[PDB]
Design goal:
heterotrimer; A alpha+beta (910); B alpha/beta (167); C mainly beta (424); A: 910 residues; alpha+beta; four-stranded antiparallel β-sheet; 15 helices; 15% helix; globular; B: 167 residues; alpha/beta; six-stranded mixed β-sheet; 6 helices; 23% strand; protein transport; GEF; GTPASE; RAB
Chain lengths: 910, 167, 424
Amino acid sequence: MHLWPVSPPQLLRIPPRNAELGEGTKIDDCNILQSMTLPQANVLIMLTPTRVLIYNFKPMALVASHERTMASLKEFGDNRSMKRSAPYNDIIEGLISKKDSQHQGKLIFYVMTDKNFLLTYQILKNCTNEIIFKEYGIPVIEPDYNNDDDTLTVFDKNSSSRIIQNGFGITKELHFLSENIDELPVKKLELRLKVVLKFDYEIIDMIGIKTFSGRYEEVLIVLFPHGLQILTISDFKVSKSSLVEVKKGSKTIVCNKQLMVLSHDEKQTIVSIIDIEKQAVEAIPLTDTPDELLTCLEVNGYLVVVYKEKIICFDTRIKKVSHSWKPPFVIKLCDKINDKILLLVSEDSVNIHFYTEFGNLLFATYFDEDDYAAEYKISDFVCLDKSLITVSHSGKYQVWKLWEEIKQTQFDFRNPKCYVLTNTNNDVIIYSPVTSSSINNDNLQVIKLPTKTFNNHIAFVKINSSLRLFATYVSNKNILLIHNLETNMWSSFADQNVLDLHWLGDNYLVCHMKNDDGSTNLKCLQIPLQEANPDVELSDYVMWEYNVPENTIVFSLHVNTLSRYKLLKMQPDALLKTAEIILVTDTQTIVFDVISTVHPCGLNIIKKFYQYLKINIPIDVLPNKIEWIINMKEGLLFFADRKFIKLGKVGWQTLTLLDNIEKIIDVIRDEIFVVQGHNYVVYSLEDLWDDKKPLVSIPIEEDLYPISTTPETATTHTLHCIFNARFSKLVVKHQIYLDQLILAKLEDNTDLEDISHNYRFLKPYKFALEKILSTKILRSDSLDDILKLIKMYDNTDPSPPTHSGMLEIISNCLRKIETKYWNHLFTNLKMTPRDLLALCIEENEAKMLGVLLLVFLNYDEXXXXXXXXXXXXXXXXXXXXXXXXXXXXXXXXXXXXXXXXXXXXXXXXX
Amino acid sequence: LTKYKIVFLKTSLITRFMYDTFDDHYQATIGIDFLSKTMYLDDKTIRLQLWDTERFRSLIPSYIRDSRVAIIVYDITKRKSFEYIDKWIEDVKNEENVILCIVGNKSDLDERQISTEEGEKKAKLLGAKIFMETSTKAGYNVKALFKKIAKSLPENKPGVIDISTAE
Amino acid sequence: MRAHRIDTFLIRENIKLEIIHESNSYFGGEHISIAFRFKHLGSQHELFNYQKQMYFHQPVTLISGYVQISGVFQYDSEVISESKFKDTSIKTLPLLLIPQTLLFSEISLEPGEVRTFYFKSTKLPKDICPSYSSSKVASINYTLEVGADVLSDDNIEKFSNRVPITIAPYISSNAEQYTSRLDKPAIILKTGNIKELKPRXXXXXXXXXXXXXXXXXXXXXXXXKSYSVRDNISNLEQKMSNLLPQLINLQNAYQINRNNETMAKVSLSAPFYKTTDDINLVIELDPITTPLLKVTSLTVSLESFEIINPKYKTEGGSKPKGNSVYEKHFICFDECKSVSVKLLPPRSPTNQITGQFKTDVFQHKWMIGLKFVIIAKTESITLDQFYEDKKGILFHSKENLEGEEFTCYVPIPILCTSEDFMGW
């Protein structure tokens, strides 16, 4: 999900043109207009006005080019922008209906030149998507053939029979992960021009896809100013072509299984959904949008229209703008780097910003800070395999290596969730809060997988409760690894086809597996113990198994470990519902209550699984889009694509609870901690089920996007990236929202003496009372509530306490508060400076006088009070706050005397 | 770490510097006549101290020399608060270089009695190092102002590895 | 996390023992403080329930308990000379052992009762050999064994569990480390204190005299604070006999040259790092490398070197091999201006890279190994013309190249850490 930079970018630049552009003069363009990736073949394509370049992506290295000549440059014009024959591989409703054709075909990619020509380049390479996934670990499939394909092999100058660099580098040739897979070589490919197409109108935009006629063909949807043209090409020959009338079209896009043109008229941005078999267009005007469209985007199944000032998320189903947000800057380039995070480039082009889909800033490079052309202005960027390659018009590019958040155990309610990132260098960062303690955890733990290979695609990484086990899965090699963190011991199980992995609480692994025998899938439940003596197989650990029905297709699997266990109600053995497994299938979703016995120390050994219900989830709630589900009392609450939805009988009727939820941080004892649009909202699961007001909701103002929370301390932790060309670091900043929580509870009219008792033990609680009195007296607010709350604090002692706490809180709030509000505070507060002086004298708390001496003088309404305070401090020191205070007072007195004395005080002291 | 000292010259800005961020550094120790708070900046914890902020202020001239910084805040709605900057910006120099700071107040209060460009030009003429505009009503640049102040505050040949390849 | 390193063991089915370490690692100059928490898993409510088999909730009495810390130096005679020291090849040598200290005498635990015993060892020797386990030829292992007796059954049963303990070397204020002697008979410290814990105008005259810096004045007044090794380690970043200065030849930037021909310039973010810090490096190679040579690939790594003392080396040849802990590869076929690399070693409360230390028989060092691949810089090192025609000139990757395998090592200090990981 999230993306952070591992380190500052690696700077490179494309080689100059090999051939001579002119007959006598040579012009090395070294100017990159656009870059795009072809993960299906593990190749990255860069475009320049005079040439195309093709690199092997994972082992970054140029492999091919075209270097068009001056004759072609004059006849067809300079290259303008390239597009890919992307395989949609699902329904469009306008072009393809049956998707069974899928399968790997031709690697075609087109480039529109400066005078409306399509060149239709083709890359031929002896590779397949499965082979690429196995060899390079690029997550490409989701609908060694000798060394003949290796290229750019550097043999040693002496003893040429030995290779010093085949791929990344030879280690000059462990039983967990691993036939020469280690080299990770660079594969050769052949680029070739196939056919040139002449267009008599400007190509505003174009999109090519693959369809099935019967034989495989390609369809090009190209938007001319007068409308849309759909051209069918079988073998690079123009087959039947269709024309549809669209006015002032700006950009085509295929979103939510439907093709739509996007025009711009009267300050309107009409979206015209096109249906070509029916030959019809449906126009959907959008809300007020004065500026022209910059680029359209499809993220999470809903369109995202970008403007030079704002970005609006258009919902395809209901056909209405559901969200709008504008960043501080003005957009120049915008594109999704992963499924959730997207990249925004400001007008300066020197810095990039990782924003989440809802507009919350995640990461930013704050260049242009007057550090001084040696400036790198970005023109495009491509992200793949956790590596962002940005490019510039100056012929240079930056290769970034990014982290990547990987989903954890989905909200085990017992303890806070862990936030873990993974890297393509088989490295894992793990951050977990401190839980019970009052001191925040500032450190990130680094785990290195036991392997020197670099083609491992870590598809699953889960931490069990108590952080005493680490279950990870490498898909490209089908290897499960259980890492005991306490003893730092790895155990590997080979030939495992796990489709999903979850922890059922401590030592239990719910594993949705795929069985090669008949391609059937099952759900096993292993019990990986800490110590395995004979190197057992993963099969023998299973104690429960559920065979998924052959016809039913599983969309996802969710495992929730409950915090409070309901009594089974029948050596009773005290059977309780320790956890619950909620399988989601296209035909029916099954909820397996995990009936277990709880020992006093823990070790919730599970006894059986009971199928609670077999609810047929309606298609209206998009079961395929469910990301989390909990079987609440007599119903299911599930986080849909963007909303929380209830399904609780009471005929089974659905209901929408929250409409703009983008993330769920974690669930801790019946609290959800969701992240609504530009807000971090803490509910209680009962209240959310009943559709009541949130427990609290605090805004997200800056890059402090929450990653984890500790509700007992009312803290939210945020991952910050200290970025700089010299070095990059990841740090954790903790924001304490205790004051906001108290304010929200007071707004709820909660009876006092429970809030104080609830948060009395919290260290920031005093300061939580602060920031409320000060803010309330500022402007004009009802002050009586906070005054009573502060007053009762320190009064409910286990001799009278004399109310030291209220004294200190009031002194701190009053001193930091400006003049013209002291009188108001003293009006609300039934006390006077003389009363405060008497109170401290009774308590002999010289610190109050030390911190309130400035307020005492120039009060709201000689000067022997200073000497008295000094003497009191001295006595207290005799009976290092007091010492420091006395020193400061003495210094101030000396200064005053110099400006004006101190001898008198000294004499009085004696 | 080092204890920076920053005389201020209203009292709204000091109040806004606190009561704004609860980022684990709430415990701002307070001395006599001055307020000290630790500020977070790129894994650096720097103790910023405000020395002072009617019936008094005859001693703050002695504070200027000890203070590492001398902030200037002026009300933008009236010219007097803007014109009197010169007397104090000379006085600070009359009383070791300092990281001078210029800022207006009540920017978002009818407004802009003095053009922002004119203020920038005059600040540059006086030699001000950093100029920022803030407001009492939830200022959107006070945090940026203090961040710039913290940044401005203060905080060899290559080793030749002559060893050749193993031959 | 848990705010401390807690190891939980089950003595019997109804009793749990938690060993809490106040810090992940204990330095040479500090004590060892460990809390043993014995808790009964039974409940008082079931204590009066009335064949029942209520034995699980019966109170349990332990007569004698003990805790002892021991240290062993393990080595193989194949590389280390056994003949001059005063299972096929591994040989052990006792370094230190705290005499068996009684944890308690006649303790009784009722259901749902927790009792904590804080054990504080005497001041460890300043030159204690640090814990070292990331090795195969030599290692130093410290273990704390805690045991007791339970009368659960008719026969007196005995429980005894050993847990590893990490020891770090003493570091002075100015980065001076003691050369930990290894060829010694043994060290016999005292038993160590144990506490059960309880559940729940001279100054004026001094100040007057002082009045006649502020922090200094306060310190003087309180006299009538950098002493802990952790504080010295933390403050080390804010500067610049058996003791040896560990930070002696610091240099931010290193220049790599082979046969007087520059290859690349390596710049470190900081002159020295810690065991739990990310090593940030900037390697500028294209502008630095000579025009006649192109660095096509570069693998950086963090390696640990064991320099075996020639005195204690068996004779029967080659430089020590670097036990790599992290590696990062870069392909620089294009004109790679510079490469920023972040070598982050494993960090965990139960697993951290051992710091830099020297002993009598061997020395432990940390270095950055950079292996380059260098080829002749042709006009186009990667592309060769394949098909030329009107409107296009196709190019394709070169089948075979030629180069060398220059490798170098940049020394870098990596000292122990003050920051404590909260523990799993």
